[PDB]
Design a protein around this ligand. Sequence first.
Ligand SMILES: O=C(O)COc1c(C(=O)O)sc(-c2cccc(NCc3ccccc3)c2)c1Br
Length: 298
Amino acid sequence: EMEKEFEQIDKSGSWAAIYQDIRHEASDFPCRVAKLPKNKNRNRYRDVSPFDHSRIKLHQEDNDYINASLIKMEEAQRSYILTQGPLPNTCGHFWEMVWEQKSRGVVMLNRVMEKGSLKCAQYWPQKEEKEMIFEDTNLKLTLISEDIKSYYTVRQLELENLTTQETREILHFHYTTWPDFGVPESPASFLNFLFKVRESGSLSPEHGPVVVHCSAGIGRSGTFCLADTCLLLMDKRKDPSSVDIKKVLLEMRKFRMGLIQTADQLRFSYLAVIEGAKFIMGDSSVQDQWKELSHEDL
Ligand SMILES: O=C(O)COc1c(C(=O)O)sc(-c2cccc(NCc3ccccc3)c2)c1Br
């Protein structure tokens, strides 16, 4: 049981060991295409690559590679696509994937610049009058509106397939106060953000899988996804006790390496899930508490 285990791991201050155990048992699979010489400039990080068996394939004959993985959680019945922050040369590829995979939402957990370096390219338009056109993939992206809150921003975008002139609305959830290698301000602000994404309908099985990215697409993105899946599993069985977080994380790690980077991110995952369980089990009252406490209005 997660709540009891959390006390014991936290009483004996052994999160580092518990976290290392997961790294030890983690799946290892080949990443051969990601390592092909022609895809060197398509990877933000030399040591972070998508497994061949779960990588998203761009629907083009030229080169189908993008550093993105399809994390399909069979039991929970929800899929996510975790990817790196798009590079100045992979933005077309990024939106091609969003279009091809029929995704409706994009969750960004990082800022364009962090600790003095550029962790992600500016892949979306910042002003309505200056839309972006990706010539290589033939797509057009236009900022339609945006609701800015204290620690996160929700943008409404219109993506157009120039070849067919087909149009889709894409919701963009940008968490701006999540430190790289760090954890959210509190379980509250995290859950508040998660439910925003949830209420947008972006996680609905009627849509393609939601795209989740940070800089490398495994640390923060990993934390985000583990928490969501654990709450969904718990929700489907309406029994928080039937959820093994570590086992769930190890299952995710079969689809993409390195998910969740620090022992504190793992500890925080517990925090978020245990708190979120309150809502799942009938306490709809907590949702307002998380909003009031995230301080999103400032
Ligand atoms: O989102 C965050 O909190 C942090 O995100 C990040 C980074 C960032 O935001 O700058 S860099 C990075 C990274 C890059 C190369 C190797 C390893 N570590 C070695 C490794 C690679 C693959 C699997 C397990 C360990 C980590 C990770 Br993750």
